Amino acid sequence: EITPEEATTIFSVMVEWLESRSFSPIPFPPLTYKNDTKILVLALEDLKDVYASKVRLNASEREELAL
Amino acid sequence: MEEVVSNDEGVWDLVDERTKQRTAKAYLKVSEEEIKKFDSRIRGILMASGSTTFTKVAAKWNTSLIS
Amino acid sequence: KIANNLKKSVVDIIIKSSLQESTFSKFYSILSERMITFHRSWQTAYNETFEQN
Amino acid sequence: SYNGIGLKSAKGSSTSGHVQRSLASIETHMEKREIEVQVSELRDRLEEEETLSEEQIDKKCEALRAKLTNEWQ
RNA sequence: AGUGAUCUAGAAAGAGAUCCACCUACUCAUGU
C-alpha cells in the first residue's frame, strides 16, 4: 500500500530528524560491553516475573525456566 | 464558571505554575471503555471460577478491586 | 440526628479522622461544607472547634 | 421511580432501590400635547354650545391654536 | 428543622486445569 514517494519522504524526514538531533546510532553491544550483566539480569528478572507465583507449568514454560 | 463551587473528590485543582493560583477545575470520570473492561474482568472472575475455592474468588475480587 | 450536646465532639471526630491519613483529601472539606450549610448549629460548632484547635 | 429519581426496577441493579433524599442539598413635545388638549377642549365646548356649523368652531379653534403658539415662543 | 422511597430468599439431576502483592534493613591508627 505504500508508494515509493511516500517511502522516500518518510526516510527523508527520519534522516532530517536524526541529523537535526545529532543522533549517534546505537552500536552493536560489544564482547566487553560495560553494563552488560546488569542488562542481562534485568532481562531475566523480566522473565521470572511471570514464573514467580504460578504452579502449573507446561513443557515450554518449564523449558524456558530451565533456560 | 458562573459560581465557583467547591466540588467532589473527583475534581482536580489545576494550579497555574505562573501565578500559583487554582485557575481551572479538571473533572474526572472513568471512561466507558474501561468500565466495560472492568465488567468483563469481573465476568472473567466469575467464569474461570468453575470449581474454585471461596477464598480464591475473594482474592480475585480483591485483586481486581484494588487494581 | 445528633443533638447539640455531641455536635462539637462529632466535629472533633471529623478533625481527628482527617488527620489520620497521610495527606489531606478533599472528602473532609466537602463533608464539612455540607454540614455547615445544613444548619446554624454545625456552623457554630466549626467556629468553636477552629478556636479550640 | 418516585419523582423520576429511582430505578426502572429493583430487579436488575441487585440493590434495594431505597432511594432516600439527601440531607446535604421632551419639552416641545409636552407643549404640543398641551396645545392638542386645549384644542380638543375647545372642540368639546363648541359641540356643547351652539356650533352646528363648522366654520365657527374651526375659526375659534384656529385662534386658540395661534394663541398657544404665541405663548410658547 | 430534618419525616418519607428497603430487590433478594431454594430443591433435583448434571456439569468444572484456575491463571497474578499483606513486614525495614549499615559507623579505628600499634608505632614512626
From Swiss-Prot, chain B:
Signal peptide feature range: none
Source domain of life: Eukaryota
Localization per Swiss-Prot or TrEMBL: Nucleus
Note in the entry: Present with 468 molecules/cell in log phase SD medium.
Note on domains (UniProt): The MPN (JAB/Mov34) domain has structural similarity with deubiquitinating enzymes, but lacks the residues that would bind the catalytic metal ion. Contains a region with structural similarity to reverse transcriptase, presenting the classical thumb, fingers and palm architecture, but lacks enzyme activity, since the essential metal-binding residues are not conserved.
Assembly description: Component of the U4/U6-U5 tri-snRNP complex composed of the U4, U6 and U5 snRNAs and at least PRP3, PRP4, PRP6, PRP8, PRP18, PRP31, PRP38, SNU13, SNU23, SNU66, SNU114, SPP381, SMB1, SMD1, SMD2, SMD3, SMX2, SMX3, LSM2, LSM3, LSM4, LSM5, LSM6, LSM7, LSM8, BRR2 and DIB1.
Function per UniProt: Functions as a scaffold that mediates the ordered assembly of spliceosomal proteins and snRNAs. Required for association of BRR2 with the spliceosomal U5 snRNP, and the subsequent assembly of the U4/U6-U5 tri-snRNP complex. Functions as a scaffold that positions spliceosomal U2, U5 and U6 snRNAs at splice sites on pre-mRNA substrates, so that splicing can occur. Interacts with both the 5' and the 3' splice site, as well as the branch region. Has a role in branch site-3' splice site selection. Associates with the branch site-3' splice 3'-exon region. Also has a role in cell cycle.
Name recorded for this polypeptide: Pre-mRNA-splicing factor 8
Native source species: Saccharomyces cerevisiae (strain ATCC 204508 / S288c) (Baker's yeast)
From Swiss-Prot, chain C:
Subcellular localization(s) per the UniProt record: Cytoplasm; Nucleus
Domain of life: Eukaryota
Residue ranges crossing the lipid bilayer per the database entry: none
Remarks, miscellaneous: Present with 3260 molecules/cell in log phase SD medium.
Cited function: May be involved in pre-mRNA splicing.
Family: Belongs to the CWC22 family.
Complex formation: Belongs to the CWC complex (or CEF1-associated complex), a spliceosome subcomplex composed of the U2, U5 and U6 snRNAs and at least BUD13, BUD31, BRR2, CDC40, CEF1, CLF1, CUS1, CWC2, CWC15, CWC21, CWC22, CWC23, CWC24, CWC25, CWC27, ECM2, HSH155, IST3, ISY1, LEA1, MSL1, NTC20, PRP8, PRP9, PRP11, PRP19, PRP21, PRP22, PRP45, PRP46, SLU7, SMB1, SMD1, SMD2, SMD3, SMX2, SMX3, SNT309, SNU114, SPP2, SYF1, SYF2, RSE1 and YJU2.
Name recorded for this polypeptide: Pre-mRNA-splicing factor CWC22
Species the sequence originates in: Saccharomyces cerevisiae (strain ATCC 204508 / S288c) (Baker's yeast)
Residues of the full protein shown: 316 to 368 of 577
Curated annotation (Swiss-Prot), chain D:
Highest taxon listed in the record's lineage: Eukaryota
GO biological process: mRNA splicing, via spliceosome
Main localization of the protein described in the UniProt heading: cytoplasm
Any single Gene Ontology cellular-component annotation: Prp19 complex
Alphabetically ordered keywords of this record: Coiled coil, Cytoplasm, mRNA processing, mRNA splicing, Nucleus, Spliceosome
CWF21 domain span: 27-71
Entry's transmembrane regions: none
Coiled coil: 27-64
Family: Belongs to the CWC21 family.
Subunit structure comment from the entry: Associates with the NTC complex (or PRP19-associated complex), composed of at least CEF1, CLF1, ISY1, NTC20, SNT309, SYF1, SYF2, and PRP19.
Note: Present with 556 molecules/cell in log phase SD medium.
This protein's name: Pre-mRNA-splicing factor CWC21
Higher taxonomy: Eukaryota, Fungi, Dikarya, Ascomycota, Saccharomycotina
